[PDB]
Design a protein around this ligand. Structure first.
Ligand SMILES: Nc1nc2c(ncn2[C@@H]2O[C@H](COP(=O)(O)OP(=O)(O)O)[C@@H](O)[C@H]2O)c(=O)[nH]1
Ligand SMILES: [Ca+2]
Ligand SMILES: [Mg+2]
Ligand SMILES: [Mg+2]
Length: 166
């Protein structure tokens, strides 16, 4: 069975854990320990292919585990997440991308830019702003809501499809 190693990165509070838990449990967690970092597994069929997603939900910027290092080095694709009502998290994307490019020694790394919490009113980051950032990286942009599930499968499945074009 094909396995796809995905890593979810982005600022604290953007909904990395909520997105991951939504994908695996079909539930929205209103609070989830911000320090728990763990990998999760999900068997899924994507475009007629039965495959396994191996997803590290990264947490914190304390000194990385061997596992986090391993996932950064061996991860095949990255979900770079900000929240549409969190301008700083969006501005921080640059750093997460620079980090990924550094670890992969490449500017050609499967990656999807995710604008999460799209169920909330009065966003401070416009869709077009994020579209422009993603375009500058040569990557897709997808809006999601871990709360309503909108876009959540599309974000993870698009990243699989990006890995397959690699
Ligand atoms: N309204 C809304 N809240 C969200 C969404 N995703 C995450 N949250 C909330 O934002 C906070 C941070 O989420 P969490 O998954 O811990 O963020 P993490 O630090 O990136 O792992 C929690 O209170 C979540 O309930 C979403 O799509 N919509
Ligand atoms: Ca503005
Ligand atoms: Mg978390
Ligand atoms: Mg390097």
């Amino acid at each position: 069975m094909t396995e796809y190693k995905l890593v979810v990165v982005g600022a604290v509070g953007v909904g990395k854990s909520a997105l991951t838990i939504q994908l695996i449990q079909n539930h929205f967690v209103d609070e989830y320990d911000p320090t728990i970092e763990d990998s999760y597994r999900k068997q899924v069929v994507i475009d007629g292919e039965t495959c396994l997603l191996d997803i590290l939900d990264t947490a914190g910027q304390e000194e990385y585990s061997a596992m986090r290092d391993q996932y950064m080095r061996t991860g095949e694709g990255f979900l770079c997440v900000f929240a549409i009502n969190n301008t700083k998290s969006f501005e921080d994307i640059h750093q997460y991308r620079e980090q990924i490019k550094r670890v992969k020694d490449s500017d050609d790394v499967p990656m999807v830019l995710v604008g999460n919490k799209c169920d909330l009113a009065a966003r401070t980051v416009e869709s077009r702003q994020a579209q422009d950032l993603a375009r500058s990286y040569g990557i897709p942009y997808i809006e999601t809501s871990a709360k309503t599930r909108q876009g959540v499968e599309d974000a993870f499945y698009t990243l699989v499809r990006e890995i397959r074009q690699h």
